[PDB]
PDB file of C-alpha atoms in Angstrom:
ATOM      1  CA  UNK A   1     -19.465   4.262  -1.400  1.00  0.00           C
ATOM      2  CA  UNK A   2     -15.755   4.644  -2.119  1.00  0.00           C
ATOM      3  CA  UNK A   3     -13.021   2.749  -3.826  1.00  0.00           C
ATOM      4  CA  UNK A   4      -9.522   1.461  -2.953  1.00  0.00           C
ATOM      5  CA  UNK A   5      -6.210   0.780  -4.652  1.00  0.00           C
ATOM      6  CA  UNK A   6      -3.774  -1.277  -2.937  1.00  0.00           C
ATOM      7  CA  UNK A   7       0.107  -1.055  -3.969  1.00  0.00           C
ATOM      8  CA  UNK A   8       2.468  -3.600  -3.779  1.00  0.00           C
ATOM      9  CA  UNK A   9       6.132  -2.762  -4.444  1.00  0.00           C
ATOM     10  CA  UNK A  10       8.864  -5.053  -5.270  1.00  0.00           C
ATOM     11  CA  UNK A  11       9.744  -8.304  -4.383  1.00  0.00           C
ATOM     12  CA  UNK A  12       6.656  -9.028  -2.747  1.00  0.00           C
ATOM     13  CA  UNK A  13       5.553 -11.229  -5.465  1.00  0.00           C
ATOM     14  CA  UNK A  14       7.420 -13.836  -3.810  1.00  0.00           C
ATOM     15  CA  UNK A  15       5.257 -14.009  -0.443  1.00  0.00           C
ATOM     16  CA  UNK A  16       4.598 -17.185   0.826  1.00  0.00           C
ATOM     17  CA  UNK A  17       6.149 -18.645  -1.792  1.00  0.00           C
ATOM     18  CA  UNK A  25       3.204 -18.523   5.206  1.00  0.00           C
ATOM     19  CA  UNK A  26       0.752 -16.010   2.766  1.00  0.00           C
ATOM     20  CA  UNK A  27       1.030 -15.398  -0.517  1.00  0.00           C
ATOM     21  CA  UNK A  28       0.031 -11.934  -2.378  1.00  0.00           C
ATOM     22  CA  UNK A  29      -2.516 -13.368  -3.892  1.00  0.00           C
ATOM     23  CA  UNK A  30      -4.338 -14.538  -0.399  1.00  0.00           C
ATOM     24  CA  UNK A  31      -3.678 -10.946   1.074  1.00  0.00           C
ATOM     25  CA  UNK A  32      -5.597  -9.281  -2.114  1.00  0.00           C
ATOM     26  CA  UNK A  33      -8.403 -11.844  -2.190  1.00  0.00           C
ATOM     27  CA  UNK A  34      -8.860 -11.338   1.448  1.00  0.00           C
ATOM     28  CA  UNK A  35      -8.918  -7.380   1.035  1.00  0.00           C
ATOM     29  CA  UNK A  36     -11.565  -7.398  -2.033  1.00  0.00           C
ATOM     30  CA  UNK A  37     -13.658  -9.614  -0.423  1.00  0.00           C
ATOM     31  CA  UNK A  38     -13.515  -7.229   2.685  1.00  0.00           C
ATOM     32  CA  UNK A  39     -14.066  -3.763   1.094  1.00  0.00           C
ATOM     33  CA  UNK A  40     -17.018  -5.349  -0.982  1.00  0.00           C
ATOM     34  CA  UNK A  41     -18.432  -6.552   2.036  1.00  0.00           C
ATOM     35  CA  UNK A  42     -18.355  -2.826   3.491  1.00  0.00           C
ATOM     36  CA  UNK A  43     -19.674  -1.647  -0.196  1.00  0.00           C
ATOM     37  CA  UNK A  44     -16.484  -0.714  -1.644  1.00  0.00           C
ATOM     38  CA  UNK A  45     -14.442  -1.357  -4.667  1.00  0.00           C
ATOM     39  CA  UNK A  46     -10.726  -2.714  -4.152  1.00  0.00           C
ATOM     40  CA  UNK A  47      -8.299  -2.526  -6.955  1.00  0.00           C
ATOM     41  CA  UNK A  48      -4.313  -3.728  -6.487  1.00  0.00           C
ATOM     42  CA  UNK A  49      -1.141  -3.937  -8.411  1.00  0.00           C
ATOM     43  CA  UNK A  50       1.952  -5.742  -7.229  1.00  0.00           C
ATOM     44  CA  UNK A  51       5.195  -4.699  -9.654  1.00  0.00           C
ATOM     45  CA  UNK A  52       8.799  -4.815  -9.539  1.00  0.00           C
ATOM     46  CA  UNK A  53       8.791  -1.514 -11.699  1.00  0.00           C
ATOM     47  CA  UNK A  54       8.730   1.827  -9.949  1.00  0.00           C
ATOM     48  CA  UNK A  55       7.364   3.336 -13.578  1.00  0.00           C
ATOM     49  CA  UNK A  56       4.512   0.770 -13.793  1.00  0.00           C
ATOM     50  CA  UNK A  57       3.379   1.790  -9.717  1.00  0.00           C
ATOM     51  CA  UNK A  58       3.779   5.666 -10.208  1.00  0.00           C
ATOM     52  CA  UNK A  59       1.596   4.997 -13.726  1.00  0.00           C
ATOM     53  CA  UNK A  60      -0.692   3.187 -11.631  1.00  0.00           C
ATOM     54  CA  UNK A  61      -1.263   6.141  -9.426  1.00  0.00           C
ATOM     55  CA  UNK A  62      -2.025   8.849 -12.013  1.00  0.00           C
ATOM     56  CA  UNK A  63      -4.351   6.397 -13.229  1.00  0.00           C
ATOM     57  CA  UNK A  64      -5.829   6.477 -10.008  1.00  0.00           C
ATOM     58  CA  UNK A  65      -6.148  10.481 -10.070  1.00  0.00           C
ATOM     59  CA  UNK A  66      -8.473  10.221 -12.907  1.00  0.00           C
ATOM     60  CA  UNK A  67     -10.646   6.633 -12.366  1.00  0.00           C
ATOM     61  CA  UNK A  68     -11.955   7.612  -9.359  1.00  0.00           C
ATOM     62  CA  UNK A  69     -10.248   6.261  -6.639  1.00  0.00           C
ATOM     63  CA  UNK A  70     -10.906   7.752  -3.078  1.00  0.00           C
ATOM     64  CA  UNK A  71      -7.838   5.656  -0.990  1.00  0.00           C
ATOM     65  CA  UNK A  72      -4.218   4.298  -1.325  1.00  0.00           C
ATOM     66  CA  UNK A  73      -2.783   1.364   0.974  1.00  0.00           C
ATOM     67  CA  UNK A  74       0.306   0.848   0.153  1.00  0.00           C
ATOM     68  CA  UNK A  75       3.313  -1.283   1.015  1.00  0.00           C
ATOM     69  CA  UNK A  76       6.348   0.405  -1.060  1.00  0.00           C
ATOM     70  CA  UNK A  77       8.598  -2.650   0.384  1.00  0.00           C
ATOM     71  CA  UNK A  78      11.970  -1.776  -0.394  1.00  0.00           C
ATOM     72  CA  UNK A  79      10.985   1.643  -2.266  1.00  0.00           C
ATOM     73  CA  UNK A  80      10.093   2.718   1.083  1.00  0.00           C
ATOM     74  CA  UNK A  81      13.576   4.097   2.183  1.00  0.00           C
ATOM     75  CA  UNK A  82      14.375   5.129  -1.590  1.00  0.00           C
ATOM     76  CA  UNK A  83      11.600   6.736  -4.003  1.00  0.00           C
ATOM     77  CA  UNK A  84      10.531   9.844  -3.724  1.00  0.00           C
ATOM     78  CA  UNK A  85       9.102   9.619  -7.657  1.00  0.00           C
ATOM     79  CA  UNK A  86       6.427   7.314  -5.576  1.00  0.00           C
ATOM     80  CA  UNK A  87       5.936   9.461  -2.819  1.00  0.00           C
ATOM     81  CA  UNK A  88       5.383  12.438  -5.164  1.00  0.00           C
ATOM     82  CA  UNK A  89       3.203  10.362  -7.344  1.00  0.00           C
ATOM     83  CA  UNK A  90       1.193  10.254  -4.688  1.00  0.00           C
ATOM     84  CA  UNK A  91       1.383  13.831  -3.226  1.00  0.00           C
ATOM     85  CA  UNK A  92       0.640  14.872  -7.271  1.00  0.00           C
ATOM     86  CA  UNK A  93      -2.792  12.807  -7.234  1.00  0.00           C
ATOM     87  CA  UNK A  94      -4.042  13.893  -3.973  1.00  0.00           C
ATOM     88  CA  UNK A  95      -5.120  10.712  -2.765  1.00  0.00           C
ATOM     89  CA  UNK A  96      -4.709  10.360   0.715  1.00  0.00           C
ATOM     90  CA  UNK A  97      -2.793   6.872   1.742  1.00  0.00           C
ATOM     91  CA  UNK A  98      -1.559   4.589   4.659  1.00  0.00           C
ATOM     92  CA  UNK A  99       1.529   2.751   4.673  1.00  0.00           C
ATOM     93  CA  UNK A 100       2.345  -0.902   5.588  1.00  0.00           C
ATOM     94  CA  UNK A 101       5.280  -3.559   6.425  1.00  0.00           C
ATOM     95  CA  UNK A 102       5.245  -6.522   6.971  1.00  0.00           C
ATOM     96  CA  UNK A 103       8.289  -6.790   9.417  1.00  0.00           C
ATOM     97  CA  UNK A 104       9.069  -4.402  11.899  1.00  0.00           C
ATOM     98  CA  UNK A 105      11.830  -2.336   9.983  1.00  0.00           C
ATOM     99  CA  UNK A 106      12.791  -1.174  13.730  1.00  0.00           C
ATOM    100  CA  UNK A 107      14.127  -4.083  14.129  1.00  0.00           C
ATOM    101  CA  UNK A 108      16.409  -4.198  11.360  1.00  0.00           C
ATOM    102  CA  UNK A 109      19.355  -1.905   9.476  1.00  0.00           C
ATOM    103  CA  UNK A 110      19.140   1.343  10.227  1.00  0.00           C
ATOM    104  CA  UNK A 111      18.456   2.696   6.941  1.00  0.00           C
ATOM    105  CA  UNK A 112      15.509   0.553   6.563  1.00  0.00           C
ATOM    106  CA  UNK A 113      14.325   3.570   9.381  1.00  0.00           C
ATOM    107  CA  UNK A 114      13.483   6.301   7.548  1.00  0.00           C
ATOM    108  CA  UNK A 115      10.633   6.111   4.785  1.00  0.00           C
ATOM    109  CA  UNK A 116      10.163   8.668   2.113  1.00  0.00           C
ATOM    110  CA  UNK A 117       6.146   8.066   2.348  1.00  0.00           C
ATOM    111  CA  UNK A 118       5.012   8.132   6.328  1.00  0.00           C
ATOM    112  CA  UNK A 119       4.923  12.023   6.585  1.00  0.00           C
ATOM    113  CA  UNK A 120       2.496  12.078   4.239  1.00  0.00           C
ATOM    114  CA  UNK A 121       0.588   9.220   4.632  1.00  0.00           C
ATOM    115  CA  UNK A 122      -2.603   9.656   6.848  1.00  0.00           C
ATOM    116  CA  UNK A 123      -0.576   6.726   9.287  1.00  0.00           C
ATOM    117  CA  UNK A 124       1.425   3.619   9.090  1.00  0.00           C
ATOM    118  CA  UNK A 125       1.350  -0.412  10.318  1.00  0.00           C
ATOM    119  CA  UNK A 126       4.736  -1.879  10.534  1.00  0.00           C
ATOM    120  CA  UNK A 127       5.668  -5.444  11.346  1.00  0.00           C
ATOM    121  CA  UNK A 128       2.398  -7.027  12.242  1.00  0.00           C
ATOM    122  CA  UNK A 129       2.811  -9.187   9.270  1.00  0.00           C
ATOM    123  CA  UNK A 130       0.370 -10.078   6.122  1.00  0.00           C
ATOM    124  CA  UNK A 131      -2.741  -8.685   8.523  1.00  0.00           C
ATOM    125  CA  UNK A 132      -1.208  -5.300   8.412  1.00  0.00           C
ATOM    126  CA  UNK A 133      -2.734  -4.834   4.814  1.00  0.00           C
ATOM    127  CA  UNK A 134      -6.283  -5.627   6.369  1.00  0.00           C
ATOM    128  CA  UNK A 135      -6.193  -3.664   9.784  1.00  0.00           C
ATOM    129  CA  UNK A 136      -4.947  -0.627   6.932  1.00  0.00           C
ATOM    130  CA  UNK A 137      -8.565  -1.457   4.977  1.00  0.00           C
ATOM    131  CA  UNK A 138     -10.550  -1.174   8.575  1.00  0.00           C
ATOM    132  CA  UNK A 139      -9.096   2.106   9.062  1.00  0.00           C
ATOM    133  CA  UNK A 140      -9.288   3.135   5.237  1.00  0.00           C
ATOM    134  CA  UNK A 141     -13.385   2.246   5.482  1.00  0.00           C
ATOM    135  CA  UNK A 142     -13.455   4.706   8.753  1.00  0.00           C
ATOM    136  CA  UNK A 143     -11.374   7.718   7.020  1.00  0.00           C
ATOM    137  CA  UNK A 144     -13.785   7.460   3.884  1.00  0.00           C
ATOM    138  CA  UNK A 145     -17.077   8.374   6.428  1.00  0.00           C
TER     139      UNK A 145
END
């Protein structure tokens, strides 16, 4: 029934490189099709090419976001009104806890708008996100 576009922000190209990108987005297609969905992703270093990515979104048809804005998380709001512009409801995941970590890496310009978030449960975070993406679309 629905499709999915997973987001990757930056540095995360360099996972595993122990999981690699590339193993997390195989993983998820082969997941949503299983369900009968369609699961589209884009990793980039670029903010513009991301926030493109999104308005593409708004007009292809897509019905879900996961995304993990890695560092953009605690710094663009161009991303988290990309979003809010498209209307395209989202949840948000890291891969460590950020909790854990500096302090600034605590606030997040995207979780008050996403639908939820999954923080520091690692690469599996992306796939527990799909499982409750599939139940949101019913």
């Amino acid at each position: 029934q629905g499709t999915l576009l997973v987001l990757h922000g930056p540095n995360l190209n360099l996972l595993g490189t122990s999981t690699t990108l590339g193993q997390i987005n195989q993983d998820l297609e082969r997941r949503a099709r299983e369900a009968g969905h369609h699961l589209l992703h884009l990793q980039s270093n670029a903010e513009y090419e991301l926030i493109d990515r999104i308005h593409a979104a708004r007009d292809e048809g897509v019905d879900f976001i996961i995304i993990n804005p890695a560092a953009f998380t605690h710094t663009s709001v161009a991303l988290r009104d990309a979003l809010l512009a498209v209307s395209i409801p989202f949840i948000e995941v890291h891969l460590s806890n950020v909790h854990k970590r500096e302090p600034f890496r605590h606030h997040s310009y995207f979780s008050d708008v996403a639908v939820g978030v999954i923080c520091g449960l690692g690469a599996t975070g992306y796939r527990l996100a799909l499982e409750s993406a599939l139940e949101q679309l019913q």
